[PDB]
Design a protein around this ligand. Structure first.
Ligand SMILES: Nc1nc2c(ncn2[C@@H]2O[C@H](COP(=O)(O)OP(=O)(O)NP(=O)(O)O)[C@@H](O)[C@H]2O)c(=O)[nH]1
Ligand SMILES: Nc1nc2c(ncn2[C@@H]2O[C@H](COP(=O)(O)OP(=O)(O)NP(=O)(O)O)[C@@H](O)[C@H]2O)c(=O)[nH]1
Ligand SMILES: Nc1nc2c(ncn2[C@@H]2O[C@H](COP(=O)(O)OP(=O)(O)NP(=O)(O)O)[C@@H](O)[C@H]2O)c(=O)[nH]1
Ligand SMILES: Nc1nc2c(ncn2[C@@H]2O[C@H](COP(=O)(O)OP(=O)(O)NP(=O)(O)O)[C@@H](O)[C@H]2O)c(=O)[nH]1
Ligand SMILES: [Mg+2]
Ligand SMILES: [Mg+2]
Ligand SMILES: [Mg+2]
Ligand SMILES: [Mg+2]
Lengths: 102, 175, 175, 102, 175, 175, 102, 102
């Protein structure tokens, strides 16, 4: 079985517990080639074993205490039409993310 | 409340400035940024500054533009000891600003002015057929770009020089 | 935007706290205050703090009350190494707060907690039939006064202890 | 001629130039037993050799860059009815003051 | 003139202590050390300290031992929020010190004491069937090792706590 | 080990320099010195500096000379924003140095260079038929005095400028 | 009884306890017109109610942690021959002093 | 041609100019599997195109302003007898080194 020139890999994202921020983050296994929608689906499956839907939530990439950016399937960074993935944004393994209600 | 986003080449001195301004702390060791936000306050009129630090790396070309949103100014930074960073300013950074926030005011910011008197930096530039960017050159580059002002300082040697950059930046945004 | 006024006896450590909070600078040498204002910012919710420093001296009994106006809280400070400053808190300061701003929330603040382990301070207190004010005692004094909380720190040894006092003070004022 | 138990003395106040703050302060000779109204009159005489009147202005006592308090003939600090003076507030020689339109 | 070498696991807080002591500067962002040297001075008797910072990583097992030469003490550091670093102290670090400088006095140093009151650290330890290393535990571990003393502090929250570690270390080396 | 004694008029900026050098702390508020000693260390060759701060006041003419003993250099300080302090240097201070330590090397030190760009200082000097002392003027004054060098800085705006004065002072004393 | 043009006054000096520095300082009442020898005699009387003699000891004037200067009846500061006093050196009330064996 | 499990690679070392420290460092190409003696030979060939010999000099690995360690073919870190190499010490590409007379 052949590996890509630009390889696909699993990553763990540390998702903030929505009920209480100071609680440990929840690890969620995802693929770097996952679209932002697929990432949200995986977080919702893991964090909600009345569920929110992928389209009801924004994925937030967090840095330190306050800094955060919203990642989406399509935005000003999209190259015209591939859906944006984690590798598009270069989200690193073990990055802190959050799901925030739109 | 004023939102400023800092952009410019890797190692040009953006994070060093924000750490000195917001944290009273200078980073001798280079830690590559992804993105970050600082909060500072100063008087010109009390002003609260939300300062966005971005990676200068092409690696993060897809996430950095998400930081430009609703910014009152972009601080386009370069390293006065490395003229290649002025080339990037006139080319990569001008083009990116024009692609993502063309109507946003731009301030041209020189970093590491202390290296103008650093013997080993001077010797290296001479062996490369280069020289440090001067203040007069910064002003000219700002004119060429359409930047509203050229300001410079030294995070390494002058905490007050960084304060004065942001005081001036805050005043330009309020007027 | 939150206005806090600091009151308490001379040399109790008010200006030292504000200098550490706002200026990242500790005053080893005592300079008697008349009045002063500092601005700090911190996150709990971004909050801008206007911090009013006042003289603990009777000399300035006529001007200090002019500082209480429209304050969100009064920080009633005392020096944990000098129990006479707790006496003043229960008497002079309680009475002044009740005369000029009786409905304003009061936070009881102990200063110089580091002196609890300072041998020469301990020896001096023992020769005076005294001892350092403890944390538990601070809490009890706060209860007796009707202060909303007791908080303490050390401007001399812990910059973060002062940050935490004002973070907590800011949170109490926002809720 | 006998001196008081609590003595009267002249003081110079450094009054901020109203037209431009960064200009040198204007020295104004006053008495410590001057009421705040008399102080304002003296500043207006010195700083306006259509003049504002004493009652149109507040006297501001400045400390450093931002801190300032308004001094008046009567306020919450008055002892019931002596008019407040410079010595009441303990305004020091060479204190920076300003006249601000009410 | 006193030479101290700091050893202990990666991210345990060695470089943070030396930066606070020697540079008055706290590194929020982790930069892995290879090796480094700082110079500090303090009074106990004026003492000049040459402080050697080493990597906690196995990656540098072959170069770190070259730092032990002619040291007056080894400061064996661990992170009070991570008991696995105490395990390394009793095993990897004890063994390395005994292999390369067995006759050199060892001081046991706990780092990050501030994390004893940090809610999220506490919650994480509880989910791991762990807890923070206590002061009393540090003293016991020092006894078990044959370390001359246990000392602790917080580079993050108390600059003076780090000063006091090195003042005490300097005094132990002079006597 | 190098002993430097600082002398010069009241409020000229001596204590501000030593506080920045030795304590990483700038005194905004003027506290008149009697005498004091600081210890700093720096690399040129490790050098330990014992720094003696003296009162510029005639009040202390009888105790200040006791500080000159066994000094490796006298740092004769003046305030670049007040030319009267240059007059004192050429008259009172030259004469005192010649009376008490005539064979000791003297370094001429300008303080507060930042005030050359301070609008209100500039306006005040103009109304007094004065101007700020320039760098070129400092060099000339040093020549006239027989001082070994002229050096200048800004305790207020440049911590590194003060470090560089003492690094240079240390190098002159070692050679 | 007439007061001097330059008045004489008592001062308290806080003398370091020689047996242990961290112990409270010992207050000693002296006159500003006291010569350094008379000051040392008074400290020795108070601190030794085999005693050291005034001539066996130097008076040290302390500032903060480390700074100190030796005061004596005659030195480079003497005006030619008045013996040096506390007022000569301008030693302030409550200054920390120490007696150190020559 | 097969690559090792632990691969060999060229590295550039930045050697301090011995005549003046503030001059630019001299780049010297070496192999990670080079013994310390072979490294010194290569630096001497590059920096001396009466030459010092490899055995006359110590290789110094520098970090920042003052920190430095001497690397040698054999020392307390040697595993018993392979000669120490750059990869043994994990000297990184573009590390600052110096040759110092023994
Ligand atoms: N001489 C000198 N060096 C400086 C100055 N400011 C920063 N530096 C040096 O330059 C290095 C890189 O600075 P930094 O601000 O981290 O770079 P950056 O612009 O944020 N880069 P990135 O975009 O990759 O995060 C610092 O580690 C420091 O050594 C300065 O004012 N003078
Ligand atoms: N040990 C110790 N000393 C402290 C601390 N904070 C202040 N001090 C000491 O106490 C002195 C007086 O502090 P300061 O804050 O100036 O007093 P103040 O309360 O503002 N007095 P005033 O009302 O008269 O202006 C300082 O000069 C310093 O030496 C502390 O946390 N610990
Ligand atoms: N809460 C807290 N965090 C600390 C403290 N000291 C350090 N840290 C955190 O721990 C991180 C690692 O510290 P550092 O000193 O760099 O680690 P090190 O021991 O030198 N590791 P290495 O051996 O790999 O160089 C720092 O980046 C900082 O975020 C402390 O006192 N408290
Ligand atoms: N603008 C500016 N002001 C300064 C600078 N250094 C000191 N000052 C100001 O000058 C004041 C007096 O400084 P200081 O060093 O205390 O004076 P001094 O020379 O020690 N006087 P003394 O001999 O009486 O103790 C300080 O309180 C500060 O406000 C500087 O570099 N720039
Ligand atoms: Mg950066
Ligand atoms: Mg005060
Ligand atoms: Mg480290
Ligand atoms: Mg002084």
């Amino acid at each position: 079985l052949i590996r890509q020139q630009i390889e696909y890999k699993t990553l763990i994202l540390n998702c903030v517990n929505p009920d209480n921020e100071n609680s440990p983050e929840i690890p969620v296994k995802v693929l770097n080639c996952d679209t932002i929608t697929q990432v949200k689906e995986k977080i919702l499956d893991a964090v909600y074993k009345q569920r929110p839907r992928a389209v009801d939530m924004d994925l937030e990439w967090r840095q330190g205490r306050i800094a955060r950016v919203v990642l989406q399937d399509e935005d000003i960074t999209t190259k015209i039409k591939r859906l944006n993935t984690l590798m598009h944004y270069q989200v690193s393994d073990r990055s802190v993310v959050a799901l925030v209600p739109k | 409340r004023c939102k400023l986003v800092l952009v410019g080449d890797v190692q040009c001195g953006k994070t060093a400035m924000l750490q000195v301004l917001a944290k009273d702390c200078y980073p001798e060791t280079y830690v590559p940024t992804v993105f970050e936000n600082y909060t500072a306050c100063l008087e010109t009129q009390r002003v609260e500054l939300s300062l966005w630090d971005t990676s200068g790396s092409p690696y993060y070309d897809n996430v950095r533009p998400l930081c430009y949103s609703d910014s009152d100014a972009v601080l386009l930074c370069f390293d006065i000891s490395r003229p290649e960073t002025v080339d990037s300013a006139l080319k990569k950074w001008r083009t990116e600003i024009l692609d993502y926030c063309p109507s946003t005011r731009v301030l041209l910011i020189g970093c590491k002015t202390d290296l103008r008197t650093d013997l080993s930096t001077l010797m290296e530039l001479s062996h490369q057929k280069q020289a440090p960017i001067s203040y007069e050159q910064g002003c000219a580059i700002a004119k060429q770009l359409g930047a509203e002002i050229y300001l410079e300082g030294s995070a390494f040697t002058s905490e007050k020089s960084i304060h004065s950059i942001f005081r001036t930046a805050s005043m330009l945004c309020l007027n």
